[PDB]
Design a binder for this molecule. Structure first.
Ligand code: HEA
Ligand code: HEA
Ligand SMILES: CCCCCCCCCCCCCCCC(=O)OC[C@H](COP(=O)(O)OCCN)OC(=O)CCCCCCCCCCCCCCC
Ligand SMILES: CCCCCCCCCCCCCCCC(=O)OC[C@H](COP(=O)(O)OCCN)OC(=O)CCCCCCCCCCCCCCC
Ligand SMILES: CCCCCCCCCCCCCCCC(=O)OC[C@H](COP(=O)(O)OCCN)OC(=O)CCCCCCCCCCCCCCC
Ligand SMILES: CCCCCCCCCCCCCCCC(=O)OC[C@H](COP(=O)(O)OCCN)OC(=O)CCCCCCCCCCCCCCC
Ligand SMILES: CCCCCCCCCCCCCCCC(=O)OC[C@H](COP(=O)(O)OCCN)OC(=O)CCCCCCCCCCCCCCC
Ligand SMILES: CCCCCCCCCCCCCCCC(=O)OC[C@H](COP(=O)(O)OCCN)OC(=O)CCCCCCCCCCCCCCC
Ligand code: CUA
Ligand SMILES: [Cu+2]
Ligand SMILES: [Mg+2]
Lengths: 269, 534, 51, 77, 45, 104, 236, 99, 59
């Protein structure tokens, strides 16, 4: 084509982002959250009202940031294939950083488990603490993640194919499947013989399973956002990077749950 | 101007702000080093009368402020943010709001670290903030919680910068940059950004375990209750050695570039040098417990770690040998960043030799938590990372800032910091092998001489930084007059021998990376079009 | 909008056209930077002993 | 002239000895509760824990044994 | 080389004065603790 | 070519590289690339360099050949036994040295 | 034993372990000073003969012969350095057949020593808390900040293995003269051995951070002959 | 009678079979040269974890297949260690008395 | 409900910044500005009460 209407464009595929006020606001909110939760843990302020509003302003600033990124990604239309591969590799490295936090928690469990202290009775699990048996409720909420992975992968491969009634049905039932997982996980927490303070076993057990618990409620929020922008026709057939992102996230969450489940419920009892 | 400095998703105007917080926090940290070494100058309770808790607060402030708010910003954040898009031809970095939030969550870690040293006398543990010294029984208050929330925020900043750097040099390279054609500082920032996201997750997990067994009644390291404090030493030093390899690898990149461009020679075997640097990176995880030879490990695992830290020692050796090889046979133009590059080699080889004296698990029983260790790391961290930082500033800031500095003041600043910092940390070795422990307010008055000599040196090392501040001022208000009126050096690469002056004015800059071809202060959209390479 | 470029439009300090001298801001920045540990020492020495 | 002590056990040759004291204490309370209530050559265990682990640990474990909240139970009926 | 003063002599002349000044700069870059000990009262000054 | 260069391949490659230059930048460039190698070049190279500096018609690069060579050589006996081999080219080309031009 | 002003060497020998540590450090420094001398000599020769060099050999960028020799030379020197440290590390844990045992349990800003090998024929274990003399009640010749009112006293010429622990913050039992340094973490007992070869006093300090009273926490070990130690243990 | 030695290492065989299962599923699914790398990896991971948690119950049936052959464990190995701890005391103090 | 091209035709053709360009984006940012200013200025009046050491009045 003409040079005159070729030099009226970006001249390189990469993103040039206009100056946006959502690093500074969410950093302000992160500072206020850190100081208020360092200040209310010692009885300096009266209630948890202020750490509540600090967590809430962090949540609503970050959801306004994600509003800005979905508007820029599908309305202004800048996410070409180079930027798509960039944000894909960035999410891969972020999740590689999350699984190392999980590896640090597993290091804590292994170090205090396979060399048990003389104050635990020199046996893992310790004396008196009735450990959770792995075959009742752990079996349901370890088969429900495999069923969730199967239905989210056929919803993905129906989104690439072209049918809407299947690619929406898979996403709806994987959302309700993992929220049923989260609710029965809370059911498992609210009747268990040990608390987070009862020894080191309850401490590292609840640390690992609670971090996975918070990770899948964040996954459920991500999948609710993805179902909303799948219903409102944002997701295309070949430009769904914000959905490939969350299916990569839920499959690696499934495999880190099975690692956590095996060595937290079978070997550790 | 509010949208150019507060929102500002452009990787050139974030690095200047990184550098501003870097010089601010480095001034605060060296004020703390001056106060520490001013109180340790003589036995008996000096300037701060009694009050050892205040000295513990001052030494943890000096250590953690000058590590996580001067060296890591002014090497990773500032220099990577300004130069990593500007060497591989990206217009600027990928994920721009991510390295804006990294900068903007730095100084709130700084302000909560500052206000942690005021409430309920204060967090005194040292920068390796240990249990049960920091648990709620032996240390009550909201001080160390803010002191480790600062580490949470700095940890988040450095990881976001790491993901930013990794993707912006794995995808947005220019037309001809292959997988091995990048300049070596790009490779250093590459490997450092890998070690960040491979290391500091373990750190943040361990220190949030410390926080929720302080305040949330859990029992990770509270020992009467099941836990053990050795698990924190493992979970901390698994980051604690990759942290200083993170702090020193861009120093190796900066020194490689300045000795390449001030000796008119390419670096001797750049491919073997980057293989050595990458193996140093992937090997620096396997030696994390050379800081724990005393606590009660077996002799077998101590034998493994004292075997593996010497194979850590060898590729740094072949890097220093390649540096001697690439300054050999050159045409060395002794300007002020080349002086820092020459001093870095000697003053880091000295610290590395005393480091491999420390690395023997046999020999670490006579030297642990002892001023020999301070003499080692205040060589290889201080002189290493900050002589590379000075050889970064005095070499790059005429191109970035666009104002040429004064030259004779830069050389008296180099010789003052060189003399006045070699006189501090050299008596620390004699204090170490004579038997002085670390973190004491002061000491049994036998070894009363070397502390006085180190304290008379720290004032020289502070006066040289005051002269560096005046160098910044004289650069900022007399830049064009130092261009014109013959006080500076203008061409960093001299004309060759048989080349005329009328022929040097044709090809002015004989670079090998992009950065010295952009005009002084460069355009906000420098690479409109891509920068081709064969 | 591409912000316009120069020799003094790359830094947050305004240097040439001011009302006060530049040495005031440039040395007050490092004055407060060098005096934050001194005010930490003062607030810690009035809380325990004397000074 | 004599200054004899526990020597060198082959089971625990490492630098740590906390399992060595805890096992010697629990096996003293496993000898003198089971085979015969007190007459024995299992004064070796008594010599070993009273030589090795400190008085605060012995007092804490004996009050835990009295209250019945002992960690590794000593086969008591 | 082949014709000229020999390479042993023409590089010994270049390097033999360099060894003494190397020894001087190393004896004053590592030997100043001796000079500061020499004047103190520990050497019965 | 990272394989080594023998002396005959060196002098033939550089004679065919001094013959082809036409500007002044080319003569000074190939002169710098000839002198910044490890060996000192035989006078078959440098009399051709003098002719190639004569073709562009400028003098001081036909003097800095001689001063760069005096910096190159290992003593002055090699320099004198060198300079009496380029005597008549220096005569009929009329270039000076440094020590007789700037007496100091 | 005790530190000396303006000293630049070890507090001298008492134990075979400290003699081995001194010999090993001198061997390591002897292997290190060649490398330091040639590195400083290379740097000096380069920066004082190539600064007055007008041309640069820019066509020297690799050579495999000298590259592999300077990467195989530090491996050789590090093998020769690591060859005796394995011998010292594997012999300094050899605690076969000690004579008597000590417990050295360290509280907040003091130590508490206790002997319980049952030759004290009053019957009991013997303990003493070992506070520092505060630095105004010093009386005309007493070393500042590392003296003690109630010293630990050990015999000569018997292997003694002492365990160490704490009841709080991680301390360290550290004497540089006897070559003994071991972190007293509150959870586990850690044992180290000794064979003191001469009578006299030995001083040390806590070498882990304890909080406010880290400096006011010394170790004083007088080593006396065996009949005087038997008399002291029976009398005390 | 082999159940003793290769049911002592349950959680070695399960983990090695998981790694080999992901490898033998990945080399099967990657031979289909039409899909993305990510879809192949997540399908191989799903097949692997399904066969692994299916084997985790086979080892439970095998675990009580071992438990009838060795009743009420963790408590009678402790007393074998206790018999070896009492013999080492009696053997030692009898020679302390007559040595 | 297939309202993406109308939103694209609106979002390309304006001068206002991106977080103010939507029609209903007045209900999302004014109460956010209010609650954010409140929520971040409010611990900086409780920090001198913590420096002075005076705790809360609870129970
Ligand atoms: C970043 C690393 C770093 C650096 C550079 C220093 C440098 C100094 N430190 Fe140290 N220090 C530590 C990190 C560092 N330190 C750590 C981790 C500990 C251990 C704490 C513990 O374990 O408890 C410690 C402990 C420590 C001790 C031992 C005390 C003890 O534990 O018993 C002392 C005593 O002298 C001390 C004081 C000083 C002084 C006077 C300097 C002087 O050198 C300061 C002068 C430095 C400069 C003048 C550099 C230039 C400054 C700039 C701002 C340049 C700006 C340029 C750019 C931005 C390009 N600090
Ligand atoms: C910047 C980060 C950094 C770097 C690069 C290093 C470099 C090294 N360090 Fe250091 N070190 C620290 C950070 C660092 N250190 C810190 C923060 C502490 C105190 C922690 C605390 O609070 O306790 C410490 C203290 C410390 C300890 C802990 C001792 C103790 O506390 O008990 C050990 C243990 O092995 C050690 C060894 C080494 C070795 C072998 C190297 C090597 O990497 C050096 C490599 C360089 C060379 C080897 C010289 C150049 C090579 C040649 C000239 C070739 C010839 C050489 C040989 C053949 C050997 N140093
Ligand atoms: C950044 C750092 C990331 C690394 C995070 C490491 C793990 C921290 C989260 C563990 C969750 C533990 C849990 O969910 O615990 C569940 C327990 C409740 O159990 P219970 O005792 O009532 O059980 C009763 C049985 N009948 O909540 C607690 O009592 C403590 C809650 C503390 C506050 C939440 C965690 C705070 C840190 C979150 C950081 C997230 C980022
Ligand atoms: C805390 C609350 C967490 C809520 C997460 C919401 C995720 C939705 C983001 C979105 O919807 O981002 C949509 C975009 C692009 O969409 P697209 O280009 O595929 O659409 C194109 C249609 N043609 O995806 C991304 O750039 C990746 C976003 C990843 C964000 C991860 C944040 C994790 C925070 C953890 C703390
Ligand atoms: C905690 C750390 C969370 C990091 C998430 C990494 C996502 C990688 C990615 O894909 O980031 C995509 C975006 C940022 O991208 P951008 O708008 O700069 O991209 C421009 C288009 N190329 O979402 C984020 O990161 C936001 C993450 C922070 C949200 C609040 C977290 C509070 C803690
Ligand atoms: C030690 C000294 C301590 C006392 C210093 C007092 C001030 C002296 C001013 C010197 C001066 O003014 O140096 C200026 C002169 C410049 O001369 P020129 O060759 O450019 O002359 C050309 C005339 N047209 O020297 C130099 O730059 C060359 C020497 C460089 C020194 C670098 C030192 C780096 C640290 C040490 C590295 C290892 C070397 C030591 C071990 C072998
Ligand atoms: C390198 C260049 C800088 C070195 C400065 C070292 C000065 C250290 C000091 O201050 O020296 C302290 C000594 C010891 O004095 P004292 O402990 O008896 O004094 C007790 C309190 N006044 O005084 C001297 O020896 C004075 C002579 C100094 C000679 C320096 C020679 C340097 C070579
Ligand atoms: C390498 C550096 C060598 C030069 C050091 C100069 C010291 C001058 C001094 O200050 O030496 C003073 C001391 C005096 O002490 P005294 O015992 O007489 O005290 C009695 C007081 N009444 O001399 C000595 O003890 C020995 C003589 C010097 C030995 C050199 C140092 C040997 C050990 C090396 C330590 C360095 C390790 C470095 C690790 C990388
Ligand atoms: Cu006990 Cu320091
Ligand atoms: Cu390390
Ligand atoms: Mg330590």
């Amino acid at each position: 084509m003409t040079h005159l209407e070729r030099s009226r464009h970006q001249q390189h595929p990469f993103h040039m982002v206009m100056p946006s006020p959502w690093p500074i606001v969410v950093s302000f909110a992160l500072l206020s959250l850190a100081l208020s939760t360092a200040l209310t843990m010692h009885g300096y302020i009266g209630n948890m009202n202020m750490v509540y509003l600090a967590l809430f302003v962090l949540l609503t600033s970050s959801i306004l940031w994600f509003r800005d990124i979905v508007a820029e990604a599908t309305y202004l239309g800048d996410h070409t294939m180079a930027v798509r591969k960039g944000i894909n590799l960035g999410f891969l490295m972020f999740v590689l950083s999350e699984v190392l936090i999980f590896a640090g928690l597993f290091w804590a469990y292994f170090h205090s488990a396979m060399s048990p202290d003389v104050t635990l009775g020199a046996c893992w699990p310790p004396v008196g603490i009735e450990a959770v048996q792995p075959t009742e409720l752990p079996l349901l909420n370890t088969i429900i993640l495999l069923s969730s992975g199967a239905t989210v992968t056929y919803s993905h491969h129906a989104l690439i194919a072209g049918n809407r009634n299947k690619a929406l049905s898979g996403l709806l039932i994987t959302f309700w499947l993992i929220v049923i997982f989260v609710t029965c996980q809370y059911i498992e927490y609210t009747n268990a013989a040990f608390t987070i303070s009862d020894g080191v076993y309850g401490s590292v057990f609840y640390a690992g399973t609670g971090l996975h618990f918070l990770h899948m409620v964040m996954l459920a929020a991500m999948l609710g956002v993805n179902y909303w922008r799948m219903r409102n026709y944002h997701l295309t057939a070949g430009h769904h990077v914000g959905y490939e992102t969350t299916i990569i996230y839920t499959h690696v969450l499934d495999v880190i749950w099975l690692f956590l489940y095996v060595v937290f419920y079978w070997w550790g009892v | 101007m509010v949208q150019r400095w507060l929102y500002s998703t452009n990787a050139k105007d974030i690095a200047v702000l990184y550098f501003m917080l870097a010089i601010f926090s480095g001034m605060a940290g060296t004020a703390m080093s001056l106060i520490i070494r001013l109180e340790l100058a003589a036995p008996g309770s000096q300037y701060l009368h009694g009050n050892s808790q205040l000295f513990n607060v001052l030494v943890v402030g000096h250590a953690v402020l000058m590590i996580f708010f001067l060296v890591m910003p002014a090497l990773i954040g500032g220099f990577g943010n300004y130069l990593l898009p500007l060497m591989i031809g990206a217009t600027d970095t990928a994920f721009p709001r991510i390295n804006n939030i990294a900068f903007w969550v730095l100084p709130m870690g700084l302000v909560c670290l500052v206000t942690s040293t005021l409430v309920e006398s204060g967090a005194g543990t040292g920068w390796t903030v240990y249990p049960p010294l920091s648990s709620i029984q032996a240390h009550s208050g909201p001080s160390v919680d803010l002191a480790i929330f600062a580490l949470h925020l700095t940890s988040i900043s450095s990881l976001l910068g790491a993901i930013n750097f990794i993707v912006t040099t794995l995808n947005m390279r220019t037309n001809g940059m292959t997988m091995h054609k990048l300049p070596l500082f790009v490779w250093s920032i590459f490997i450092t950004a890998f070690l960040l996201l491979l290391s500091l997750p373990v750190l943040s997990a361990g220190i949030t375990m410390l926080l929720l067994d302080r305040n949330f009644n859990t029992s990770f390291f509270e020992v009467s209750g099941g836990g053990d404090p050795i698990l924190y030493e493992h979970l901390f030093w698994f980051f604690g050695h990759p942290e200083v390899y993170i702090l020193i690898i861009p120093g190796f990149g900066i020194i490689s570039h300045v000795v390449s461009t001030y000796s008119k020679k390419p670096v001797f075997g750049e491919i073997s040098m980057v293989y050595a640097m990458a193996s140093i990176g992937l090997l620096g995880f396997l030696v994390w417990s050379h800081h724990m030879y005393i606590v009660g490990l077996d002799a077998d695992t101590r034998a493994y770690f004292t075997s593996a830290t010497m194979i850590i020692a060898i590729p740094t050796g072949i890097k220093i040998f390649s540096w001697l090889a690439t300054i050999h046979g050159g045409s060395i133009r002794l300007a002020t960043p080349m002086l820092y590059a020459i001093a870095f080699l000697f003053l880091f080889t000295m610290g590395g030799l005393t480091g491999v004296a420390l690395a023997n698990a046999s020999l670490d029983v006579a030297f642990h938590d002892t001023y020999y260790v301070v003499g080692h790391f205040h060589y290889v961290l201080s002189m290493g990372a900050i002589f590379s930082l000075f050889a970064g500033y005095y070499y790059w800031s005429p191109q970035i800032l666009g104002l040429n500095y004064n030259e004779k003041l830069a050389q008296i600043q180099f010789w003052l910091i060189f003399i006045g910092a070699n006189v501090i940390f050299f008596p620390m070795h004699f204090l170490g092998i004579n038997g002085m422990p670390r973190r004491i307010p002061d000491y049994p008055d036998a070894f009363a001489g070397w502390n006085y000599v180190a304290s008379i040196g720290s004032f020289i090392a502070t006066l040289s930084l005051f002269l560096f501040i005046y160098i910044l001022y004289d650069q900022l208000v007399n830049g064009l007059n130092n261009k014109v009126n013959n006080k500076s050096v203008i061409y960093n690469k001299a004309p060759d021998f048989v080349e005329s002056n009328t022929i040097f004015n044709l090809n002015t800059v004989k670079s090998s990376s992009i950065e010295f071809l952009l005009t002084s202060p460069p355009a906000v959209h420098s690479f409109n079009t891509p920068a081709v390479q064969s | 909008v591409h912000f316009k470029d120069g020799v003094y439009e790359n830094i947050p300090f305004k240097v040439k056209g001011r009302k006060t001298p530049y040495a005031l801001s440039h040395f007050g920045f490092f004055a407060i930077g060098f005096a934050v540990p001194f005010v930490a020492c003062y607030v810690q020495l009035k809380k325990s002993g004397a000074f | 002239s004599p200054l004899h002590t526990v020597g060198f056990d082959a089971r625990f040759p490492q630098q740590n000895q906390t399992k060595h004291c805890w096992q010697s204490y629990v096996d003293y309370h496993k000898c003198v509760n089971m085979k015969g209530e007190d007459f024995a050559p299992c004064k070796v265990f008594w010599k070993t824990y009273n030589a090795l682990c400190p008085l605060d640990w012995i007092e804490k474990w004996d009050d835990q044994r009295e209250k019945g909240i002992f960690a590794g139970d000593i086969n008591s009926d | 080389g082949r014709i000229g003063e020999s390479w042993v002599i023409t590089e010994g002349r270049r390097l033999i004065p360099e060894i003494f000044q190397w020894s001087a700069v190393l004896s004053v870059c590592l030997g100043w603790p001796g000079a500061v000990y020499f004047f103190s009262k520990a050497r019965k000054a | 070519a990272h394989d080594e260069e023998t002396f005959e391949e060196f002098t033939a490659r550089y004679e065919k590289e001094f013959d082809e230059a036409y500007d002044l930048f080319e003569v000074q460039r190939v002169l710098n690339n000839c002198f910044s190698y490890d060996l000192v070049p035989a006078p078959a190279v440098i009399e051709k360099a003098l002719r190639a500096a004569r073709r562009v018609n400028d003098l001081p690069t036909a003097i800095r050949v001689f001063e760069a060579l005096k910096y190159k050589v290992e003593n002055e006996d090699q320099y004198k036994a060198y300079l009496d081999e380029l005597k008549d080219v220096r005569q009929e080309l009329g270039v000076p040295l440094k020590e007789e031009l700037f007496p100091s | 034993d005790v530190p000396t002003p303006y000293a630049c060497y070890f507090q001298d020998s008492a134990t075979p372990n400290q003699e081995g540590i001194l010999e090993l450090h001198d061997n390591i420094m002897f292997y290190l000073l060649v490398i330091l001398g040639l590195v400083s000599w290379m740097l000096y020769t380069i920066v004082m003969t190539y600064s007055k060099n007008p041309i640069a050999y820019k066509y020297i960028k690799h050579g495999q012969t000298i590259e592999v020799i300077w990467t195989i030379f530090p491996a050789v020197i590090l093998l020769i350095i690591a060859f005796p440290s394995f011998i010292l590390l594997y012999l300094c844990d050899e605690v076969i057949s000690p004579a008597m045992t000590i417990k050295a349990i360290g509280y907040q800003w003091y130590w508490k020593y206790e002997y319980s090998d049952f030759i004290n024929d009053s019957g009991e274990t013997v303990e003493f808390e070992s506070y520092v003399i505060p630095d105004e009640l010093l009386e005309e010749g007493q070393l500042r900040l590392l003296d003690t009112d109630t010293s630990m006293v050990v015999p000569v010429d018997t292997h003694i293995r002492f365990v160490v622990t704490a009841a709080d913050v991680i301390h360290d039992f550290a004497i540089p003269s006897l070559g003994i340094k071991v972190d007293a973490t509150p959870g586990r007992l850690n044992q180290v051995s000794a064979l003191i070869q001469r009578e006299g006093v030995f001083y040390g300090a806590c070498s882990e951070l304890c909080g406010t009273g880290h400096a006011n926490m010394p170790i004083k070990i007088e080593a006396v002959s065996l009949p005087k130690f038997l008399e002291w243990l029976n009398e005390q | 009678k082999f159940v003793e030695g290769l049911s002592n290492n349950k959680y070695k065989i399960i983990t090695g079979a998981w790694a080999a299962s992901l490898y033998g599923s990945w080399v099967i699914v990657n031979k289909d040269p039409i899909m993305t790398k990510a879809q192949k990896i997540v399908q191989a991971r799903m097949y692997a974890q399904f066969i692994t948690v299916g084997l985790l119950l086979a080892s439970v049936g095998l675990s009580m297949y071992e438990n009838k052959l060795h009743p009420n464990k963790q408590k009678v190995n402790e007393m074998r260690r206790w018999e070896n701890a009492l013999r080492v005391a009696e053997e030692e103090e009898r020679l302390e008395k007559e040595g | 409900a297939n309202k993406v091209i109308q939103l694209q035709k609106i979002f390309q053709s304006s001068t206002k910044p991106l977080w103010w360009r939507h029609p209903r984006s007045a209900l999302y940012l004014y109460p956010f500005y209010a609650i954010f200013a409140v929520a971040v200025v409010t611990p900086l009046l409780y920090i001198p009460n913590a420096i002075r050491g005076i705790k809360a009045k609870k129970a």
